[PDB]
Every structure is written in structure tokens, then in C-alpha cells.
Write a protein that binds this ligand. Sequence first.
Ligand SMILES: *[C@@H](O)c1ccccc1N
Ligand SMILES: [Ag+]
Ligand SMILES: [Ca+2]
Ligand SMILES: [Ca+2]
Ligand SMILES: [Cl-]
Lengths: 14, 303
Amino acid sequence: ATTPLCGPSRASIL
Amino acid sequence: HMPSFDFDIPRRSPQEIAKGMVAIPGGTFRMGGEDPDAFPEDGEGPVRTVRLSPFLIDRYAVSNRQFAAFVKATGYVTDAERYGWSFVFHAHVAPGTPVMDAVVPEAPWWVAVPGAYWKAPEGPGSSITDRPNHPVVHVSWNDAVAYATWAGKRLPTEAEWEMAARGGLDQARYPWGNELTPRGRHRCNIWQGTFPVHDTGEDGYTGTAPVNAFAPNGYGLYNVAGNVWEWCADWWSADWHATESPATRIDPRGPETGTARVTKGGSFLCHESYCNRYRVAARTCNTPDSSAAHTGFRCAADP
Ligand SMILES: *[C@@H](O)c1ccccc1N
Ligand SMILES: [Ag+]
Ligand SMILES: [Ca+2]
Ligand SMILES: [Ca+2]
Ligand SMILES: [Cl-]
């Protein structure tokens, strides 16, 4: 539904 | 980029640095992709002719054994160790392993696991004793640059990575051609089955494979597609390379500033029905102190 995510970033969980 | 290190750079000979590397001669190649199913946000296009200076590139992604030697020689502490956690795919977290409640937006299959790092890739209790020849993972971009500099090397640019990964073919879909499994043979370690629920392991592996698994490409490089995402030197953007200029077409280095560094090549998790990012033109990014169980790197060098 949004661009698929292959690179989980540390910033993204804040 | 100007890194800071806590170890001296050892003196190395040219023949030492070149061991396990392939010499890529200078020349042109057609970089990028225009697959109509490509996600626009990824900026796979435009296809363009890029000229590169000669360079060396590792046949193999850096292995656990090699990273352990770097740590032993330097005392290097990886970003995942400083943070105290790293990302592990949910299917590989042993039941009862302490986990953070953190959720990656839009990717709930990633688990932030305290104590997961390169030597314990699934968290406390796991080890790499049986994976000495597997690619090192839970290494951030910073860790990769630290290793490469110690080794007398550097990260490849995205253009160097793609020229080497294409292995002498002109605008093929994969490193080896246009068929995913020519003659019914698996050529890379990606996902089979139903992502993210069940990996059938039809290609032999439901996690990382040894760095020398599968046939190499035409230049002798192993697992440029699949196995682990590979850090490149460039800052990420989706459109810097749309400009037609010497800076974008002759030894291009990417934009001068950014927030995430480019990763190439796909991993054991990639699948046509989710990301479709194991095509050689594919690209994504991650922030430079981030680390994950499916991301490693290979080095490049100037001859
Ligand atoms: C949403 O757009 C989505 C979700 C899963 C896989 C692909 C895409 N495009
Ligand atoms: Ag992917
Ligand atoms: Ca696989
Ligand atoms: Ca790869
Ligand atoms: Cl091994």
C-alpha cells in the first residue's frame, strides 16, 4: 500500500 | 565522508589487498533499470551509460571469519553493540528471547532484539560457530567503512557495485541473464513461498548462505544477487542520477549530502510478490548506523 520496506532503520522505531 | 577510528590503519602491500578481489577494467556500462513494475520512489531509472575507472572488487561479501579477524586486530565495537540491539527477522527469533516492543512502520516482521549483533545474529544464545564462511551481518555502514579502511579498501560506489554485479551483460534482469532459475536451477538465495509467513527454502537456505554459494556471475563475483543486502558508498537519492552530467555519468559518487546510504543486491528475504528487489538494477537504502540480520557488504579498492 506504500513502498515496500527492505531496509529497517534505527530511526524508524522512535 | 570523514570517519573517525580508534585503531591505526595497518600497512599492506598491493598484492595482499588484491587477494580475493577481481580487477574490473575501465569502461562503460548501462546502469539502472526501466522495468515498468519498479517502484517510482526507488529511482531505478533512468537507464544511462556510465563510465568507470578501473577498480578492484571482492569476489565474496565479507565473511564472519574475516570480520572476526578485524575485531581481534582492532578491538572494534560495532554500532549494534553500542546500541545494544539489532534487527532480526521474526522467524529466526527463538521463542522466549527477550525482544523490544519496537515496530518498524510497515514491516512488522522485523524484531528489535537486545544483544543481537554480528557474533550472535539471532540474539543471546546464538553464535556463528557454524557460519564462519557466511557473510557478516548486523554490520552498519559505519562498521563496513571501518572494516574496509582497516583492510586497505573502501566501499564500492553504487555504479561500481552494479557494473561488477552485472558481470559483462548489457541490461539483463539478473547478474546471470533474464531468467530467475535458468534450466530449473536456483542461482541466488532469496525467498520462496509466502512472504513473510513461510519460506520454503527451495533454494537451499532460509537464512544466509555461505559467501561462495551458487555459481558466480561472469566476472567471478558470488551472491551479488540475494543472500545479503550490500552497503555502497553513495548517499541515497531517487533523482540525483536523473541529471545528465559528468558528475552523474563519469565515476559517479552520488549526491554530496543525504540521510541514508545505498544498499544493493537484495537478500534471502526478497520475493517477487513483496519487494521484487533482487533484480540487479534494484536499489534501496538504510541509515548509516542501522544494522540488520540480512545486510552485509563487500569491499572495493583502487588498483
Ligand atoms: C503496497 O502498495 C504494497 C504492499 C505490499 C507489496 C507491494 C506493494 N506495492
Ligand atoms: Ag527485498
Ligand atoms: Ca532462500
Ligand atoms: Ca546481495
Ligand atoms: Cl560456513
